Design a protein around this ligand. Sequence first.
Ligand SMILES: COC1=C2C[C@H](C)C[C@H](OC)[C@H](O)[C@@H](C)/C=C(\C)[C@H](OC(N)=O)[C@@H](OC)/C=C\C=C(/C)C(=O)NC(=CC1=O)C2=O
Ligand SMILES: COC1=C2C[C@H](C)C[C@H](OC)[C@H](O)[C@@H](C)/C=C(\C)[C@H](OC(N)=O)[C@@H](OC)/C=C\C=C(/C)C(=O)NC(=CC1=O)C2=O
Lengths: 214, 214
Amino acid sequence: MASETFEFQAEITQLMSLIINTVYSNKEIFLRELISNASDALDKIRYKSLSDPKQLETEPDLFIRITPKPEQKVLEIRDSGIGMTKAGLINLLGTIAKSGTKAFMEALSAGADVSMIGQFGVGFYSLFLVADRVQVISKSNDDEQYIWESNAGGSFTVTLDEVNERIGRGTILRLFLKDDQLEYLEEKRIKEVIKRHSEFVAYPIQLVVTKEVE
Amino acid sequence: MASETFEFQAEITQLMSLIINTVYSNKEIFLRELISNASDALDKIRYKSLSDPKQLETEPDLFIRITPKPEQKVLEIRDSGIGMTKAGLINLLGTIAKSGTKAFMEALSAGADVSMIGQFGVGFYSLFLVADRVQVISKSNDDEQYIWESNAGGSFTVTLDEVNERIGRGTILRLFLKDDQLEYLEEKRIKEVIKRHSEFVAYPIQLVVTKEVE
Ligand SMILES: COC1=C2C[C@H](C)C[C@H](OC)[C@H](O)[C@@H](C)/C=C(\C)[C@H](OC(N)=O)[C@@H](OC)/C=C\C=C(/C)C(=O)NC(=CC1=O)C2=O
Ligand SMILES: COC1=C2C[C@H](C)C[C@H](OC)[C@H](O)[C@@H](C)/C=C(\C)[C@H](OC(N)=O)[C@@H](OC)/C=C\C=C(/C)C(=O)NC(=CC1=O)C2=O
């Protein structure tokens, strides 16, 4: 339906500017970050299901799933983790000041490698190394499916989802890749980054490949 | 939103009963039929674009795409063809009597092989050889995305689509496969049926495969 618009916390806008603009080099670590967040969301739903097992029923399979959509120059990273509510997307992804946002920027400007970003708890923002636009589509058991959207600019939108496949539970990171970074649409490149930086993951990592029949 | 319910034309209910119940044997021809309908829908949008090229812009790529979803025991056949309107789904897929429906039943009962079903213009109904439920999800340039749904019973539903991925234009056949017929979730089996009965197709046939990264 209609979209609500929210302004970014000053520093989060700052951080997004550093990342999408400068940085360079170790760009491929965005995938380790997103997979690690997916893994954390999966840990969370699974831990919650220990004392409330009905939670797993909206989507009984625990997985991480990567889907290149070359036509749209899009890369999606999906998990059937715990998902986020409207309130969650609004507060934790923009309006409330992340503790480590300022400290990481200072660390960065002082010599720190971007790959450290995850230890400051703002690794989600690494996605702007390779993308200039993101939709975070999420479904918690405690709320409806919503779309959060940001182009790195000063504000983001949150919209009730009536346009995307129903996920039973969890989250899709829909990355609109930059033109210089289309290599992350390639199967071999994807397997390679995964093997190098994400060897220790408790959940299956699926790769969706589209092949033409001969 | 809310669902409108429609009764099937008597004979179409008859036909669906023959097919989902008896038949046996050459079940795999359902795929030749669906691919051929997809090809016809693609011919139609392409022919229409000859004198109105803006038509292709809702989805500039012409393709047929097969997606097994083993978790849900579902097989989807998609095309970016001309799609159908609400009016279309209601009239041509149920309420108005198909010319060849009765003649095919007589041919069938007289010895005719099911594979003939396409020459009687009711091949769409072959899908009930392998499925006991279908959603036909379609998007014409002249209307909104709708879901038509039937379980072979006497009536079907038509619903405004707010729950599925937006297709830009065209149609998805979402088959809920029977338990005896899960083989059509398998990549090798799919390639094999395609090669045997659908060698001459003017459009790319894509197969979406989900593989676990090691
Ligand atoms: C330790 O928890 C983590 C925190 C606190 C974070 C807000 C907790 C969050 O709300 C309470 C849920 O507990 C958790 C299930 C949601 C995810 C992991 C999402 O990812 C998904 N579901 O796949 C992630 O991205 C869409 C959301 C924001 C991530 C931030 C801004 C970041 O930069 N790094 C972080 C990574 C983390 O693991 C981070 O700050
Ligand atoms: C020659 O046109 C065909 C006819 C007339 C048919 C109603 C024409 C239709 O409306 C006017 C559109 O022109 C056409 C674009 C839509 C499709 C081919 C759909 O398939 C898709 N889009 O992928 C198909 O199935 C969802 C719709 C009903 C098919 C029937 C009941 C059948 O059993 N066989 C038929 C196969 C055909 O090719 C048939 O009767």
